[PDB]
Amino acid sequence: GEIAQTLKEIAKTLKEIAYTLKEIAQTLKG
Amino acid sequence: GEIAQTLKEIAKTLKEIAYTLKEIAQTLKG
Amino acid sequence: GEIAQTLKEIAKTLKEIAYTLKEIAQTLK
Amino acid sequence: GEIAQTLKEIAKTLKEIAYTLKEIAQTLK
Amino acid sequence: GEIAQTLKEIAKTLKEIAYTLKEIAQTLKG
C-alpha cells in the first residue's frame, strides 16, 4: 500500500534528521 | 485520498527540514 | 475524519519547523 | 484506537520541537 | 500491523529529536 510506503519514507527521513541533530549538538560543544 | 496526499506533503517537508539541518551543520564547520 | 485532521495538524507544525530552521540557517550565515 | 493515539502523540511531540526551535532562533538572534 | 509499527517508530524518533534539540538549546545558553 501507498500509505505504508510513504510512512516508511517519513521514518527514514526522521532518522536522518535525528542523526544530523546529534552532529550539530557535538559541533556546538567542540 | 486526503490521508495519502497529506502524508506525501509531510514526507516532502521532512526532506526540506533534513536538508536545512545539513546546511546548519556545515555552516558551524565554516 | 479524525486521522486526516491530526495529519493536517502534523503537516502544519512541520511547515512551522521548516521555516524556523530556515530562519536559524540565515542567522548563522 | 492505537493509530489515532500514536498520531496524537506525534502531533504533541512536534509542537514541543517547534517551540524549542523558536527558542533556539531567539537565542541566536 | 505494519502501519501501526511504523507510526510507533516515527513517534520514538521524534522524542529523540525533541531531546537533542533541548540539549542544543541549553548549549547555546552556555
Numbering used by the authors:
A (entry chain E), B (entry chain B), E (entry chain A): 1 to 30
C (entry chain C), D (entry chain D): 1 to 29
Excerpt from the paper describing this PDB structure:
Our hypothesis was that these should direct larger and smaller oligomers, respectively. Encouragingly, the new Thr@g sequences consistently scored best as pentamers: for the a = d = Ile variant the pentameric assembly was favoured outright; while the a = Leu, d = Ile variant scored equally well as pentamer or hexamer. We determined X-ray protein crystal structures for all Gly@g and Thr@g variants. As predicted, the Thr@g peptides formed parallel pentamers. Summarizing these data, Type-2 CC peptides with sequence repeats LppIApZ and Z = Thr, Ser, or Ala, form pentameric, hexameric, and heptameric αHBs, respectively. The average distance increases from 8.0 ± 0.1 Å in the Gly@g nonamer to 10.4 ± 0.1 Å in the Thr@g pentamer.
Expanding this pattern to hpphhph can produce larger α-helical barrels. Here, we show that pentameric to nonameric barrels are accessed by varying the residue at one of the h sites. In peptides with four L/I–K–E–I–A–x–Z repeats, decreasing the size of Z from threonine to serine to alanine to glycine gives progressively larger oligomers.
